[PDB]
Amino acid sequence: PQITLWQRPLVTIKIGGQLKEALLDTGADDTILEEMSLPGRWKPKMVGGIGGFIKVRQYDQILIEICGHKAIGTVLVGPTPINIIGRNLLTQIGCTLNF
Amino acid sequence: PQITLWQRPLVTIKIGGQLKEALLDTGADDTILEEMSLPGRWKPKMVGGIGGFIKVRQYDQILIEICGHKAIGTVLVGPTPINIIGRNLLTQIGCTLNF
Numbered sequence: 211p212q213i214t215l216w217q218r219p220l221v222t223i224k225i226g227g228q229l230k231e232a233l234l235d236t237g238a239d240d241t242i243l244e245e246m247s248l249p250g251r252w253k254p255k256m257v258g259g260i261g262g263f264i265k266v267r268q269y270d271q272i273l274i275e276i277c278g279h280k281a282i283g284t285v286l287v288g289p290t291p292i293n294i295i296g297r298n299l300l301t302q303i304g305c306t307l308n309f
Numbered sequence: 310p311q312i313t314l315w316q317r318p319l320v321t322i323k324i325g326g327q328l329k330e331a332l333l334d335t336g337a338d339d340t341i342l343e344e345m346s347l348p349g350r351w352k353p354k355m356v357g358g359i360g361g362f363i364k365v366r367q368y369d370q371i372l373i374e375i376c377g378h379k380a381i382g383t384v385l386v387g388p389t390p391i392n393i394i395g396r397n398l399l400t401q402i403g404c405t406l407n408f
């Protein structure tokens with residue numbers, strides 16, 4: 211679909227049976243979700259934005275559906291203020307930026 | 310142009326007769342530039358990202374050309390890791406997300 215940026219680009223995603231709102235972020239290299247339980251083994255990582263760095267748990271090969279499109283990739287879980295779908299899964303659904 | 314997201318969406322912006330590289334960020338409500346000298350008065354702003362909040366200086370009605378498109382708006386200057394073109398200027402050059 212075409213999405214305007216007059217308003218923040220929030221979409222419903224489905225992860226582990228749970229439905230959630232997530233921000234489509236082209237400034238985000240990786241996808242970061244708010245604290246949750248994901249199966250499998252994770253490794254620790256430190257990621258930085260405005261304001262600095264936060265510690266997250268990295269899970270690889272997690273399947274997530276973004277508006278009906280299935281996508282699989284690394285998902286970071288940690289104390290993020292909002293769920294963010296980064297470039298690593300935006301490319302998988304064919305998302306591009308146009309003007 | 311159509312920009313895919315396999316790489317970070319970086320463009321050249323011209324501000325103050327100077328060229329710089331900035332990130333097109335749909336996840337940023339505002340535009341934040343690394344420390345620089347801009348004309349006029351400024352007023353204070355608190356902005357929060359993934360690592361918490363930073364205090365920045367707000368300048369209004371600044372001309373900035375993003376890929377040969379002249380935009381005129383609010384630019385925040387402060388301790389950002391990278392120059393960020395936010396939604397307030399991405400809407401003025403007609404940018405949308407498509408998949």
Ligand SMILES: CC(C)[C@H](NC(=O)[C@H](Cc1ccccc1)C[C@H](O)[C@H](Cc1ccccc1)NC(=O)OC(C)(C)C)c1ncc[nH]1
Nearest residue numbers: 237238239257258259260336337338339356357358359390
């Ligand atoms: C973990 C992701 C989110 C992170 N990117 C961001 O935080 C980018 C900026 C950046 C890019 C590249 C290197 C450093 C900083 C900004 C995000 O788009 C964030 C997403 C967000 C929205 C709402 C609340 C909290 C966060 N937007 C954001 O911080 O907005 C402002 C206006 C403060 C710039 C990233 N990408 C690469 C390294 N870190």
